[PDB]
Structure formats: C-alpha cells, structure tokens
TrEMBL record, chain A:
The lineage of its organism: Viruses, Duplodnaviria, Heunggongvirae, Uroviricota, Caudoviricetes. It comes from the Viruses. It comes from Vibrio phage ICP1_2004_A. This is Uncharacterized protein.
Automatic annotation (TrEMBL), chains B, D:
This is Uncharacterized protein. It comes from the Viruses.
From TrEMBL, chain C:
It comes from the Viruses. This is Uncharacterized protein.
DNA sequence: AGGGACAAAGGGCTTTCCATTTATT
C-alpha cells in the first residue's frame, strides 16, 4: 500500500537556474529525484517516486538578458590582483515558490513521519537555494485510481510537469511543436583514471554529457491518470515517467 | 609533518539569510502592510561627463526605475529571516588530514565575540545602507524560538556592550560550537517621512531600455539575499591600521574602494592557515579570522 | 590548406566536440567523440591565445573547416591520406577534473560520481538555426568576457553570444 | 606627485526633495483643502509650420491634458518636504588618496553663503516656475523642528539680506559642515483668481494619443521631484560675465539656450578639481562652486 | 655538529593576442 506526503508553498530563494549550457529556467527533474535519494540516505524513508509543481517562478534580470552575480577572489596566489574587481564566469539566479509531493512506504504510525520530514526540510537545499517558508506536511493514502484522485487534487494550485517525447531532435521539435526542453539523464564518455581529486576516492568516475527530452507544463486538476505526473530513476543513467509517455 | 594543501577545499555557508521584503505602514498602526511597488519614469538632464566638453550643450533622455513611499504612510517595514547552522568543521571537498589538523588546532577560539558581532550587525541595522541614512528613529524586532525581543537604538560603528544582545549571542554560540540550527525572524521599522524614497537592490543587467533597474518579486520591491549577507560578515576589525570594520574576505579586499588591506604583508588567509597547520601558535585575533572565514565559507583553489 | 594545418599543429592545436571551457574558463578539459561525427556535425578547436593564420581572404582554419562540410570530407578520407592522417593526429584527448561539478547518480546497486561537460555542436547549431527560423524566446549570452580570445576559436569569431532556451514555467495568478 | 583620479567616483545626493502636491483653498480659509484633478480635452485649432505653406487651411485636432482651479476657490496650495543630509565629503565609489586629499583642500570653504542661498531659493518662491507669473500675493510657510516661519515678499533675482532666512541658514550650515540631517516642510500659497490655470509638470511620453500629458499621483496634479531640486540649487553667479543665476553643473550648461557658460575656458569642474588636489590654491569664490557639485553628486571618473 | 652550497616551487610583473550581424513584445 502506497503512501503520499505533500508539502505546499515551499519558498526557495537563490536557485542557480543554469541546468545546462542551452537551458536556463526551471531546474530539471533529476534535481528532484536526487532530493528524494538525499532524503532516503539522511532519514531512512525509502522513496521510489517524486512529483513536483510550480506555483511561482521568476528568473531575476531583464526579459532577454539574465543578471550576473558578482565574484570574489577565492584562490591561492591571487594577492597582487585583489584590489581590482574579479574575473567573471556565467551563472544566473532565480526565485520561486514550489509544491513537492513524495511517494513513500512507511508501515508505521503517521505522527512521527511528519516530524521526520520536518527535521529534514529545515536542513536541505532545493537546488542550491534557501528554504524560507513551508507548510506542514500531511499523509495521504490511495489504493486504486478512484482513491488516487484525492492525492492529485490535494495540491490544487499547481503546474505539474509531464513527459512528451522527442520526435527527431530538440531544436526542430521546439520550433515546430512549441515545447521547451529538460535534461532527463546523462551519457558517460570516458572513465577518469586518477581519483585523488574526487570527493569519494572509492566510487568509479566517468565524464558525461546531458541528454535532453521535451516536457509539458499542465494543470494538475486536468490530468487523467496521476502516474503520468511522476518521475523515477531506473534506466541507464536516466529518469523516466512511471505512467509512460503522455 | 611537512604536509601541503590539497588542490581544492570547499566549505559551505553557515549563515543563510533570505531576501527581505519592503512594506509601507504607520508608526502608530503597524498592521496595514501595503506593498511598495517599483515604477518607471523618464527624466531629462544634461550630459556633463568627464572630458567631451564639445557635447556640453545637449541633453540626454534617460529611463530609470523608482520606489517611493505613498503620501499616506511614513514608515518603512523590512522583513527577513536569518538561519545559523552549526557543524562548521566538516569539509565538503579536499578533507584529508589538512582539515583535521586545522580542526584540532582551532578548537579553543572565542565563539562568543563572533556570535555577538554577528547578532549585533543585525541589531544595529547595518543591513540597510541607504534606508538607515535619513531615518529619524529605527526600531528592530527579533523573534527567535518564541521569545520576542525589541531594540530601540544602537551605535552601528562601535561594538558597544549591552545585556540584550548577549542572550541571543549565547544562544547562537552554542549552535556554532556543537550541532544544530537556530532561525530568527527580523523586522525593521524606519521613520522616514510622508512620500520619501526607499532604496532596493540594483541589478547587474544589460537591458537596452532602462538605464537603472531595481530588484522586485512580483512587482514589490526587495533586496538581494547575498546583498544582505554582506552586513553580517562585517566584523573584521583586526587588520593592520584598523579604522572601520570591513567584510570578511580571504585577502581583505574591498573592490568598491579599490584597495586590499589584508593582502600583501603575510597576513592573509593562505599564510595563517598554513602556519596554524605547521605548528606555529597564532594570536587571539587571527584564530578568530580563520574561523570567521570558515563560517563565511567558500572554495579555495590551489 | 596544408600550410594552415601544419601551422595549427605547430601550435598547441587541439580539436574537440566536447569540452568544459564553456562552463568555466580555467578548465582545459577536451574530449573528442568518435561515434558522434556525421554529415553535419561541427567541431571546435583550441590553441593558446587563439592564434591563427589567414588564407588571403580573412578566414582562419575554423571558418574553412566548418563551411560546406569540409571536416567530414577530410575525415572520411576522400581527399586522400595526405591530409586525413594530419587530421586524425590533431584531435586528441585531454582530461581534467578541476573546477567542475561532480554529482552522484544511482546505478544498479551502487552510485556513480560523474562530471557534466559541455557540447560544442549543440551551441553552434542552436545559435545558427534559431535565428534563421525566427524563434524569439531565448537568452542571448556571450562567454569569454572582455577577452573572448581565451576559450575557443568559436568564441572569438562570433562575439554576438550563443542562444539559450528560456524554460520559465507559467504561474498561478 | 601628480596623482590621477580613480576610474570610478560617485557622490550621493545631499539634498532630497519630494514630489510636491497641489491643493485649492481660499485666501481667508487655509484649511479647506480640495484636490486639483487632471482632465482631458480636445482642441480644434489650425496648423502652421516654417515649411509647407500649402497646408495652411486644414485645422488639426489635438488631445491635451489640463488642470484648473474650481470657480469657488482662488488660492493654489503647494506642499512638499526637503531633507538636508550631512557628511558631504564621503565618497560612495572610490576610496582615498583622492577624496581624502580633496577634503583637506575644501575644508575651509564658506558654508554660510551656500546655505543662505539654498534656503533663500525656497523662501522666495523660485520653486514654482509658472504659477508665480500672474499672482497678486505669494506667501510661504516653512516648518522646522516645532518652529514656524512665514515669508511674504522677497525678490528672486537678488539675494537680499534679512533676519529670518539667516535663522534657518545657521541650522542648515551646521548639518552641511558636520553629520546628521534636518527636515523642512514647505507650503506655498498663491492668490491667482477664480477659475485660473495651474501648471503641473509634463511627462515624457513616446507617440501617445495625447499631445500633452501631465504628471499625476492617483489622479491629483503634482510636480516632479527633480524639477523641485533644480530651483533650489540655482545659486551659481560666479561664471565669466555673470548676469543671472544658473544651476550648479560641472559645465554650467543650460539646454534651453544651447550654450555652456563654464565649459571651454579652463573654468569647469574637472580642471578646477585636478588643480586643487595637486596643490594649487583655489580662489575664495570657486571653492563654493566645487563644494556645491559634491552636494549635487554625479560621475567624476576617467 | 651546523653554516654554506645545490637546486627546487611559489610568486610578482610584463607581455600577448585579438576582433559580430541585430530583431525581438
């Protein structure tokens, strides 16, 4: 029996929006499925799926030009040049209010699960941001598709992300079908042989490149089956929808 | 010993502020929290730039943004949160032994002074910078762990002792020494006048329409969070020929003025952090400076 | 074009289709892929200080090598082995990990630390396609700073900046 | 010797006026304030250009804005507030080596002469610029820190000597010679006549359906705040062949006449500022010219 | 037993190369 926990109106401030070199905007789904794995390591709750909405989102800067963050001198041997500003490398920022929904199995009491979620939300960061204000989570139980509608409509103000699939490539599909991409996995290229600069020293390392797909932002109360609004790992270094391609 | 630094060290940010908001209220009734929206005006002036005296008879048309208080209210309200997170000695990258021999050599510092100055920068209203200048009477309200405090007037420049700040400082220093977090919600009330000008943060943008752009969330004026985090880290009074407190930087650099104070005389971070590892005993102030840099965080390349 | 090929190989002279100089300037990590080169795949090239040589028209090696699919024409070997061997000796691997993001990923019963790097074909094809096909939801961003002569020849030749997709979702009123 | 100015220098405003408001009251009843709202009318006159004499028979149609006093009231009321901020020598952008050695050369200037004129431009009624023409009697009321002053008739082109302006100038010069701020509240009453025309500030618009758009705050006729501040600093009578006062500006240029009075004859700000740093002795009358430019603000960088 | 030589690793300063094609709401 599956259980759901829903956090509403999570204010995140200072999200670095550069998901890839050609996409600047919402953070992709891989961030939100990495967040569930982070919760599984830190707390102990096993999470197999994650859905997410977007109440508000705004990339700071003007319309066609994003703003640049200032840089400070943070390197050994930069004493001579320290009085002058800095070299500047690109990274944009964005501000938004999100809604999160997990899919856990707990098989225990429901009055300690909310406390275990709340002990984690005060610590973690949503894509390098700062969590300012969030509502208290609540536990939802669904059995079949008729009882699943409850957990779907629970989070009413929302804009969930559903899969759409690629026809030939992202450029022609974006021009013709009017869709905007999202990275949903990475393809590895060459193994790093010297692991004295990694942060694990034991895990094998690979150089990788992003691989894209196309998405659609949809009203959550206008989705037939809720399983097309979920995301999970599984495939070769890739994430995918539970309910297939919408 | 004779051990050298790794290529990259990385420490997270232990002091997390949020972006503040701006409201217009009254000194009597502080409940009508009306938002302060950002407008757009066009202004006709003269050029008057250095040199180019040939073009000193023409005018230049400039489009800017502005944010003023309405003529019915005379009080500015600033709201934000500040979170202090402990465990300041755990490394993110390049840990090894370099971090352990520094942790065991910096476990006898003075966290009380650092916590007191970190709270007193919030308490004195140093996070305002143009909003503080011109205001008649400021009033700060701090809500930490269902114990509400209120301050009246402090001196920004000098760290004067008082019994109100010491309780919150002792609460913060217990978090920064052990493990855990503490969040405090800060509100600032400023008495300016009917129809005065408030000052949000200005963008580093290349827009072709506006000469000046202000930061806003859904139209309402606001300040950047990384802008606000600079005032908390203004505790550095231990550099050579110290006159005014500066921000905590590894080289002690103020690029706005164009000078670097701490760098160039074997007093910066990358000399003291090697001397502390290699057995040399430090003074009470440059033991605090390194720890203040760790609380600030950052990466450190080779 | 042998007189320009030997001049580029007398310099540093690397040819890649996947690098990390598009993320951070201080990277110097270059990857050439064998399974991705096709009939329209455009590659990039790096030398110190972006030093080049003209061909009595105003074109360097990068402007020649991308026009009329010349890189595949030398690469497939239809221009002989005189230039194909020099082209194959040009593109080598250069591996660096510093100043790059390193994230974990969940494989089958274990984790895998991996480093995302940039794609040279995607940037150039994206800017040169969206402009001609009139797509006006983009971010124009130039990289290299005041001296773009430090990252790539493709940085230097087109200073107008690459185009990035806007991915701002709609919001609840 | 011969130190160059830094590439980034910036000076903030030291005089902060607010955007004025217009009301309609009677002359013998100073409390029945009503708003002067802005309306739109359509006019059907003829056209005449210094070209196209062939089209002198087609009446063009224009859509303009207007604002007038009602027919039961005959006195226009203008309300605003002016703030004077001290510490006029501290630079925002740019550090020392230049501003610090300029402060020690501009230390002994005559702040009384500047602070007399800055208040006399408010007391005389120069801050109106079109409502002054065609007025039987003007009356200005200035309120500062629970003290009220009333001025009836003052010459505008001549800086006369009296006993009540000097009571405010000694307060303003104390702020401008030190630190702090002071607030003046100014109300102007002019007796124009019933049904007369009032003159707000126009707005810069691009190809609007209106041929003339006026500034408005919630539908009430107002004046621009940077238009108010131009009348205050019209104190400059020290240029070559001086007849009438002009605004303080580094080239002394007015865009209406199309001429720069101070530029082109080694008399402008940037030539005078560089000479005073290097050790030359300034004249007793242009020391107040350079000091008035730091109160105005601007960009002085290479 | 200890200054002096033998040669390295950081570090300031000084070059150095180097060029597009702007609409969008």
């Amino acid at each position: 029996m599956r259980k759901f926990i829903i956090v509403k109106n999570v204010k995140v401030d200072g999200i670095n929006a550069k998901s890839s070199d050609i996409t600047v905007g919402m953070p992709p789904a891989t961030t939100f499925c990495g967040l569930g794995e982070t919760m599984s390591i830190k707390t102990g709750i096993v999470v197999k799926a994650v859905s997410y909405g977007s109440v508000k989102f705004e990339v700071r800067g003007s319309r066609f030009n994003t703003s640049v963050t200032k840089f400070a001198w943070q390197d050994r041997g930069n004493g001579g040049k320290a009085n002058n500003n800095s070299p500047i490398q690109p990274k944009p920022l964005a501000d938004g209010v999100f809604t999160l929904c997990f899919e856990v199995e707990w098989e225990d009491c429901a009055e300690v699960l909310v406390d275990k979620v709340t002990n984690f939300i005060n610590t973690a960061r949503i894509a390098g941001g700062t969590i300012a204000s969030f509502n208290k989570p609540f536990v939802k139980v669904a059995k079949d598709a008729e009882e699943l509608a409850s957990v779907k409509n629970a989070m009413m103000p929302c804009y969930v992300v559903v899969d759409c699939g690629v026809e030939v490539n992202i450029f022609e599909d974006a021009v013709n079908r009017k869709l905007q991409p999202m990275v949903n996995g990475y393809k590895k290229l060459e193994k790093i042989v010297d692991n004295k600069h990694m942060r694990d020293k034991f895990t094998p390392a690979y150089l990788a490149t992003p691989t894209y797909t196309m998405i659609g932002y949809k009203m959550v109360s206008n989705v037939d089956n809720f399983d097309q609004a979920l995301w999970q790992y599984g495939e070769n270094t890739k994430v995918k929808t539970i309910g297939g391609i919408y | 010993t004779k051990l050298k630094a790794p290529a990259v060290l990385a420490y997270s940010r232990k002091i997390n502020p949020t972006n503040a908001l701006m409201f217009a209220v009254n000194w009597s009734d502080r409940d009508n929290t009306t938002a302060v929206m950002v407008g757009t005006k066009t202004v006709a002036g003269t050029q008057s730039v250095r040199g180019n005296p040939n073009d000193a008879d023409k005018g230049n048309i400039q489009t800017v943004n502005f944010a003023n208080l309405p003529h019915n209210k005379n009080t500015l309200l600033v709201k934000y949160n500040v979170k202090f997170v402990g465990d300041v000695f755990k490394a993110e990258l390049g840990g090894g032994e370099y971090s352990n021999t520094l942790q065991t050599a910096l476990e006898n510092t003075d966290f009380g002074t650092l916590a007191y100055r970190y709270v007193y920068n919030i308490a004195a209203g140093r996070t305002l910078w143009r909003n503080r200048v011109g205001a008649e009477s400021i009033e700060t309200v701090i809500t930490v762990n269902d114990q509400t405090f209120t301050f009246s007037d402090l001196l920004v420049n000098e760290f004067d002792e008082d019994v109100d700040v010491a309780e919150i400082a002792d609460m913060v220093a217990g978090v920064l020494s052990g493990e855990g977090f503490v969040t405090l919600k800060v509100e600032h009330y400023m008495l300016l006048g009917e129809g005065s000008e408030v000052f949000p943060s200005q963008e580093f943008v290349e827009n072709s329409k506006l000469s000046k752009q202000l930061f806003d969330l859904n139209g309402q004026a606001a300040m950047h969070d990384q802008k606000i985090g600079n005032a908390i880290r203004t505790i550095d009074t231990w550099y050579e020929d110290a006159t005014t407190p500066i921000a905590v930087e590894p080289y002690g650099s103020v690029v706005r003025n164009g000078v670097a104070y701490r760098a160039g005389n074997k007093t910066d971070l990358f000399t003291l952090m090697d001397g502390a590892v290699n057995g040399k005993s430090l003074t009470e102030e440059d033991q605090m400076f390194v720890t203040a840099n760790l609380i600030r965080g950052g990466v450190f390349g080779g | 074009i042998k007189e320009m090929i030997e001049d580029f190989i007398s310099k540093g002279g690397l040819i890649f289709t996947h690098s990390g100089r598009y993320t951070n300037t201080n990277n110097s990590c270059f990857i050439f892929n064998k399974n991705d080169i096709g009939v329209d795949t455009k590659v990039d090239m790096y030398t110190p200080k972006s030093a080049g040589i003209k061909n009595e028209e105003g074109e360097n090696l990068w402007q020649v090598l991308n026009k009329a699919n010349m890189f595949y024409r030398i690469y497939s070997g239809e221009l002989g082995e005189e230039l194909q061997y020099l082209l194959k000796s040009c593109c080598t691997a250069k591996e660096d990990v510093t100043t790059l993001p390193q994230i974990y990923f969940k494989n089958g019963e274990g984790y895998d630390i991996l480093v995302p790097i940039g794609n040279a074909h995607n940037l150039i094809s994206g800017t040169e396609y969206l402009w001609e096909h009139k797509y006006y939801n983009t971010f124009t961003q130039k990289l290299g700073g005041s001296n773009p002569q430090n990252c790539t020849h493709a940085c230097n030749k087109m200073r107008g900046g690459f185009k990035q997709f806007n991915c701002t979702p709609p919001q609840v009123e």
